[PDB]
Design a protein around this ligand. Sequence first.
Ligand code: FES
Ligand SMILES: [K+]
Ligand SMILES: [K+]
Ligand SMILES: [K+]
Ligand SMILES: [K+]
Ligand SMILES: [K+]
Ligand SMILES: [Mg+2]
Ligand SMILES: [Mg+2]
Ligand SMILES: [Mg+2]
Ligand SMILES: [Mg+2]
Ligand SMILES: [Mg+2]
Ligand SMILES: [Mg+2]
Ligand SMILES: [Mg+2]
Ligand SMILES: [Mg+2]
Ligand SMILES: [Mg+2]
Ligand SMILES: [Mg+2]
Ligand SMILES: [Mg+2]
Ligand SMILES: [Mg+2]
Ligand SMILES: [Mg+2]
Ligand SMILES: [Mg+2]
Lengths: 50, 170, 113, 126, 216
Amino acid sequence: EHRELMAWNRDENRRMQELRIARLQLEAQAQEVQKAEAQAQRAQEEQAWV
Amino acid sequence: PMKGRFPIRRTLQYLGRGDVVFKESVKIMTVNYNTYGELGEGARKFVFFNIPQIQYKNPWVQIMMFKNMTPSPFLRFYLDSGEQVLVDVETKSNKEIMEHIKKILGKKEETLREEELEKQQRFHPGNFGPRKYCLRECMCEVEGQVPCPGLVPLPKEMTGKYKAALKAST
Amino acid sequence: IVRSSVHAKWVVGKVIGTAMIKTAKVRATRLVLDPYLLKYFNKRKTYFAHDALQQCSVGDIVLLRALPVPRSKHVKHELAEIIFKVGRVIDPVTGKPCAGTAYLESPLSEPRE
Amino acid sequence: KAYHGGHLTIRLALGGCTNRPFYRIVAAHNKCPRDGRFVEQLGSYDPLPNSHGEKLVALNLDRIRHWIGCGAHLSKPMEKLLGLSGFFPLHPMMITNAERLRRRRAREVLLASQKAESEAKETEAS
Amino acid sequence: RKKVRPRLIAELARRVRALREQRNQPRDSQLYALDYETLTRPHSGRRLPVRAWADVRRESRLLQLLARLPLFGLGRLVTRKSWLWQHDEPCYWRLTRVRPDYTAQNLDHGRAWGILTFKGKSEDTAREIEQVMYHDWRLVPKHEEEAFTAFTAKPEDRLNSVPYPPLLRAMILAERQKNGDTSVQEPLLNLERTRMRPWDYPAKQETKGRAKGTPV
RNA sequence: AACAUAAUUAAUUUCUACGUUUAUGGAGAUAAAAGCAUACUGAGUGUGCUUGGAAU
RNA sequence: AAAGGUUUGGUCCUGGCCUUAUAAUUAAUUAGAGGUAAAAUUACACAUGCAAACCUCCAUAGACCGGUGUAAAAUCCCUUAAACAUUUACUUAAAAUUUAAGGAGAGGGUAUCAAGCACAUUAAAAUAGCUUAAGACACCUUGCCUAGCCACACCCCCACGGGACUCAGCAGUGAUAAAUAUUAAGCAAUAAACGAAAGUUUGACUAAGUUAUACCUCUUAGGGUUGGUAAAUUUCGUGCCAGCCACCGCGGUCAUACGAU
Ligand code: FES
Ligand SMILES: [K+]
Ligand SMILES: [K+]
Ligand SMILES: [K+]
Ligand SMILES: [K+]
Ligand SMILES: [K+]
Ligand SMILES: [Mg+2]
Ligand SMILES: [Mg+2]
Ligand SMILES: [Mg+2]
Ligand SMILES: [Mg+2]
Ligand SMILES: [Mg+2]
Ligand SMILES: [Mg+2]
Ligand SMILES: [Mg+2]
Ligand SMILES: [Mg+2]
Ligand SMILES: [Mg+2]
Ligand SMILES: [Mg+2]
Ligand SMILES: [Mg+2]
Ligand SMILES: [Mg+2]
Ligand SMILES: [Mg+2]
Ligand SMILES: [Mg+2]
């Protein structure tokens, strides 16, 4: 019974790890889009400042 | 007014509500949690509300808590065999954390009842002795038996004072 | 291979000193219930542990194993593991280097370096 | 106290008040006081007849068998109780004492008959 | 703690007292000397019991008999007057080693070893003889050894099994019926494993205590 | 300080002899504009500060 | 605590003291007997008697029971190992009882005791460490853990030795203190010791004696109080006197407060 519970524990940890990668993946897409826009403003401001 | 927030946490009834009694293998439970964030809210409530209850039922287990050392909160149990059980409690409610640890490393209800019955094996209702250990100090208390001479005087013929006098007379 | 008599077969603590040769001074903490207040506080104990390789640094969390025979008057434990190295933590959940509540290496990436 | 030497024994510990004795059957180290530290209580003995005319003995026969199996000696009064119950054979002196009592009452009866015969001689004299 | 301090005098006293005991050990001639007028041991002042008075004046000690024999009577048979009176069957010791007390001016105190034959049954190994200082020993003549040691064993008639006590028998039969065992066999105790030696059987002298050397 | 005798049943003796504590002027009864800190003298004044003085 | 009395010219706040409840001891006054429990000024000194024997010699026992609270923060609970001056069985395995080494946690006071001064590690014998405001060290006081446990046994912590040279066993005595049980009977019961046993011994104990210290059952009635708190004073004497008060207070001539009634 101990071994079965220790196997179920690892499965629960992997199931949550899969969700973590899915959530962090979505953030990378959204944050990347924002970063491109922010870099554009820096380019416009940097050119104006120069 | 009792000091602090949620002063009910400092009552024996609340501490006795804990249901997680660890197996004898469990020796240490380190808690890594973050004080700031949104995915670690359940972990913070677990340290606030449940860690007192866990320690109360498991006095010999070392509970050591670490703050803001890792990106995510987790629980790591150290067993006597040398095994290390890592648990991930991110995005998990404090109630969910308690139920999870109970399942993997918590004694079952059947086991606990057997120990309670075994603990009282040497207490016998028939046994006589002090009130701390026994129901009745003396057999005089039982109904139908000869009552205590202090409460009720014994018949003259049942007294050593009377019997000694007759032997002198004989 | 009988085990130690001491109750603390396994103790976790922080390395508060390392000035003795091959020995690390470790501070462990346990929770003790105040009977009047019914609140738990930290009772801390100091444990001398045999650091064979002198691989310990002040501030790192370590796991100690009770020695079967006391090495000396105070050295009754050995260094089983360094749970967290000071400033060099590796997230147990993901396995990536971290520096506080942040990832030095993103878990999405697979550097394998 | 910190005893050195001795053995476990099953004996009667005296309780009650003056003229009202009551016993606790107990297993105790022989060197301990009669009513002091004991190991286990194995029953009780009330030597005074109750309203129903019954002297009441309680024996924890499971624990008594356990402690006799571990070397526990028995006091002579306890061997007499175990013999009357039927758990042990009757003690040799229980049988011998009953024989002495029979021989002592036989003499008394014979003396009474002789006295009545002597009284009969007085009746003959008138 | 750490305020508990050594006790040098206590340690010195224990050791020192031990040395005196080893050097000043008394001898059999002194511990077991007797005053026959008062029947009291001078070393300790111990007065012998009343039932032993007749034999102390009427019987000999073992090494009083053996001191008169060549090689201190190695190989000879010796019996006790107490056994002769109590047991019809031959009871004797076959002597194998004898260590007299050389200090004794008549070599009448010492230790002995031999092989026991009690009530016709002979032991297989030699052990030290107890009660050597008793006035109870009788040397067997060589010409009477064959007639003295002649024994024919009778078939043993002591029961080998007996009933259980009345209550303990009922508890056994009740357990049988509860467990489904249906039988009318009578529970029987087996007495062979635990048969008692006679009370006067020779005891182990090697494990017996010796009196102290402090005079009264 | 702690050797040696013995040994065709086995034993014998040795197994020592300093320092540290307690004890033999002040404050309390029976009545027979101000202040704080500080300096000087004598409360007087000096310097700074507070309003728990005052001022349409 | 269900509270009450008491700072003031008055009100409110704050804050101490005291009262009302419960018990132990001693004391004043008072009291019949009976059942029961308890018995206690002092680790001051002790006249006298007793408290350990048994038993065919060897051994065993007198290492217990009983007593006192000397010492020491001394302990509790727990772990490990080994034993015993033991038992019972096997000629080897179950117990009781101890000992030693330890530690999850808990454990009196003073911080005007703030530093301790070798208190550490390594094991080629080097390193410079160890404890401490999360209370070290020092000093002071204290039996606690209560089916009971610990410590002590004339003193010198010990007891080879020395000396103030033995009742902290029961009962008694002197001194001391507010403090006051019999110089008693029996081993019939239970417990212990001894014996193979019939049995023997025991100031343990059992049954009594003593004592309103407590409870129970009866039966006589005594003790105190009477301004407020706080239940209850009628006439006289005294006149800031004599006295009374736990607190507030009373008495200097109409005293519900003192004294008698
Ligand atoms: S307490 Fe039971 S007879 Fe007294
Ligand atoms: K008040
Ligand atoms: K009085
Ligand atoms: K002492
Ligand atoms: K008796
Ligand atoms: K009255
Ligand atoms: Mg004998
Ligand atoms: Mg200013
Ligand atoms: Mg009085
Ligand atoms: Mg005692
Ligand atoms: Mg004291
Ligand atoms: Mg004295
Ligand atoms: Mg002494
Ligand atoms: Mg006395
Ligand atoms: Mg004495
Ligand atoms: Mg008194
Ligand atoms: Mg007597
Ligand atoms: Mg016997
Ligand atoms: Mg008037
Ligand atoms: Mg009046």
